Amino acid sequence: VQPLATQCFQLSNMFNPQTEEEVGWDTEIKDDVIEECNKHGGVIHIYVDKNSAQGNVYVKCPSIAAAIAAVNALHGRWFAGKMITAAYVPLPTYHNLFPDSMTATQLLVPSRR
Amino acid sequence: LATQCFQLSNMFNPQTEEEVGWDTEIKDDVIEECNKHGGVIHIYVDKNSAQGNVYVKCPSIAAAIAAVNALHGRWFAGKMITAAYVPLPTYHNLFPDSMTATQLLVPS
Ligand SMILES: [Cl-]
C-alpha cells in the first residue's frame, strides 16, 4: 500500500542548493508555498531545508484535508528540468524532526503582500 | 552545526533487528552512500537504540556534510531517515575506536 495522507508532507526538487543564486530564495519559496496553501486549506508549519541536495521543503497543514489540498496544488510544478514531488510524513517522524510542529495550530500567511 | 560526525535516526526499529545482517547491511548502506561523497572512517549501528540510531564519522567535515545533505530527508526502509550532526567529542567518547580510525571504510 501507499502511506496514508497525514497533516505533514515533504516536498522535493523545490530547489537545488548548488544553483540557488538569489538572496532570500528560501523565504520566497516559503512565501510561494504558503500563498499556494492559502488558496486551499492553509498551512501551520513549513520548513525549507536549504542544505538538502534534493531540495526538500517540509510542510504541515491544519488538517489532513488541508494537507491533501496543498500537496495536490504543489506537486505539479517543475524546476530546472526536475519535477517537484510530495511525500507524506507520519506525525511521530515529522514531530520528531519538527517538535514545535506538534502544537502549532495557527494558519500561516505569506510575508509578501 | 556540521561536523565530521552525525547520527542517523529512524534507520531501523526492534522489528528490523529480527532479520540476520540487518545491522551489517545498514552499516554497508551508509558506507556506500558515504563513498559516493567523501567516504567514512567509522560507523556504529546501535542495536540497543529505540530510535534506530546509526552513528557515522567521515574523514572530513566536507565529507560528512555531503553525506548528511544526501542522507537527511532520504527515505530508507519506508521510513524517512533524519541526520543530526554529532559533536566530534561526543562521538569519540561514545565511540573510542573512531578517534584513531583513519582507514576509509568499505562495504563488507
Ligand atoms: Cl517515517
Curated annotation (Swiss-Prot), chain A:
Family: Belongs to the splicing factor SR family.
Keywords: Acetylation, Activator, Isopeptide bond, mRNA processing, mRNA splicing, Nucleus, Phosphoprotein, Repeat, RNA-binding, Transcription, Transcription regulation, Ubl conjugation
PTM per Swiss-Prot/TrEMBL: Aryl sulfonamide anticancer drugs, such as indisulam (E7070) or E7820, promote ubiquitination and subsequent degradation by the DCX(DCAF15) complex. RBM39 degradation results in splicing defects and death in cancer cell lines. Aryl sulfonamide anticancer drugs change the substrate specificity of DCAF15 by acting as a molecular glue that promotes binding between DCAF15 and weak affinity interactor RBM39.
Note: Antibodies against RBM39 are present in sera from a patient with hepatocellular carcinoma who developed several autoantibodies.
Oligomer and partners: Interacts with NCOA6 and JUN. Interacts with ESR1 and ESR2, in the presence of estradiol (E2). Interacts with RSRC1 (via Arg/Ser-rich domain). Interacts with SF3B1. Interacts with ZNF106 (via N-terminus).
GO biological process assignments: mRNA processing; regulation of mRNA splicing, via spliceosome; RNA processing; RNA splicing
Organism: Homo sapiens
Subcellular localization(s) per the UniProt record: Nucleus speckle
Entry's Gene Ontology molecular function annotations: RNA binding; RS domain binding; U1 snRNP binding
The RRM domain, residue ranges: 28-91
Domain of life: Eukaryota
Function of the molecule: RNA-binding protein that acts as a pre-mRNA splicing factor. Acts by promoting exon inclusion via regulation of exon cassette splicing. Also acts as a transcriptional coactivator for steroid nuclear receptors ESR1/ER-alpha and ESR2/ER-beta, and JUN/AP-1, independently of the pre-mRNA splicing factor activity.
Tissue expression remark: Widely expressed. Highly expressed in pancreas, skeletal muscle, lung and brain. Expressed at intermediate level in kidney, liver and heart.
Record's protein name: RNA-binding protein 39
